[PDB]
Amino acid sequence: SHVRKIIVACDAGMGSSAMGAGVLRKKIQDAGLSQISVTNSAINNLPPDVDLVITHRDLTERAMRQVPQAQHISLTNFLDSGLYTSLTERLVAAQRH
Template identity: 60%
Template sequence: MTDSAEASDAAFDYSQVDKIVFACDAGMGSSAMGAGMLKNKFKKEGLDIDVTNSAINQLKGDEDIIITQKTLTERAESKVPEAKHISVDNFLNSPKYDELTEELKKHQK
């Protein structure tokens, strides 16, 4: 997470999350694999949340949480400033996925 995302984290309403997007330059490859991994994790935990992937330029503005590699977070934040942004080093292996899953489990109905 960027510093601004961490600062506003306390105010973020995880109970309202229904769309998470992995965003990268092309919207293919590693972001698709990251989205698939998170979908499987959510399924195992009983979380019914839409997880997809997209190119940053194709973001629609209705995303609740956007996950990007650290080098792309600033671009995604400027495209959809109202979303919660999570920065990761690697789409395929990040401890932030477990943290996100736990927060969602605590707040989802």
């Protein structure tokens, strides 16, 4: 049971979904974590095997519901680089640990 799956979901499964996925994906690849996979999909579609779910706070309630047993991270803004940076550092820390 290793956390390696990160998926971004929103009500459109596309709009903000695309940018969030791309940025996170790039950082993960840069960190040499080829073992971690990144994809995006609509909220209505989230595999129960997902370990990490990243969505906008406005829709985090929904994702939690589908899988309240999963790990959810809420965003505030689409280009909130500060939040993205913090989250990335954290995941890296959790990866080693």
